[PDB]
XYZ file of N, CA and C in Angstrom:
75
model
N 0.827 -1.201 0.000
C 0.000 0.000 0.000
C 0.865 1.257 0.000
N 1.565 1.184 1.252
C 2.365 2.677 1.598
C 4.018 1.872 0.747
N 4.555 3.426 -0.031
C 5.821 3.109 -0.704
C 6.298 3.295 0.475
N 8.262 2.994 -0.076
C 9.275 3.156 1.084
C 9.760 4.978 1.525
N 10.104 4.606 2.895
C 10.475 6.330 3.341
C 11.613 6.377 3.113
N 12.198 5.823 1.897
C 13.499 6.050 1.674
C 14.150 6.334 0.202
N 12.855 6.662 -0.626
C 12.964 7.107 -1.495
C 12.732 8.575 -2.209
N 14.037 8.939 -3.148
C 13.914 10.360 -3.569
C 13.084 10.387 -4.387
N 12.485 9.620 -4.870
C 11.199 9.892 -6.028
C 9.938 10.187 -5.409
N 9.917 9.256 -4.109
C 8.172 9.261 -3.472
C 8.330 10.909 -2.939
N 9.020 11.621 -2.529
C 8.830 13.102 -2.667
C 8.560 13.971 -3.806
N 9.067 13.460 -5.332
C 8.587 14.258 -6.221
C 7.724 13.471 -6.869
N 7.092 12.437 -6.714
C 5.945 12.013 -7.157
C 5.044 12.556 -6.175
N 5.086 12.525 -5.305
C 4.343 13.157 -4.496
C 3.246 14.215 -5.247
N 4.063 15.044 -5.833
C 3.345 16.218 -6.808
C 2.853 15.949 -8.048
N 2.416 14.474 -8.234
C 1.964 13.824 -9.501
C 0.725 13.127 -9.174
N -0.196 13.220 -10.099
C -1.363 12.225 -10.132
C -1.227 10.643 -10.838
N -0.389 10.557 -11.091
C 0.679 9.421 -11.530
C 1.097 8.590 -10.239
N 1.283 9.024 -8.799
C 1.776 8.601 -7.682
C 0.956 9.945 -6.532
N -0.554 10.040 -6.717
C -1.110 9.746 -5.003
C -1.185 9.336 -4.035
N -0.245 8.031 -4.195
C -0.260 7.035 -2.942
C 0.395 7.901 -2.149
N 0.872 6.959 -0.851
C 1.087 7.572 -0.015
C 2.141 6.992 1.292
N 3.379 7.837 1.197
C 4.487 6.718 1.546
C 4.900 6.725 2.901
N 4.972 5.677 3.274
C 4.660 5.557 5.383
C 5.773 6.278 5.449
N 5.488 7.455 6.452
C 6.492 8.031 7.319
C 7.015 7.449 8.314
């Protein structure tokens, strides 16, 4: 469900509707 908190992408996907998910802090 939740991506890893250790990735530099899940921060700039972050700003994509491509990647809404949502990555465990």
């Amino acid at each position: 469900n939740c991506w890893r908190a250790e990735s530099d992408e899940a921060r700039r996907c972050y700003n994509d509707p491509k990647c809404s998910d949502s990555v465990c802090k």
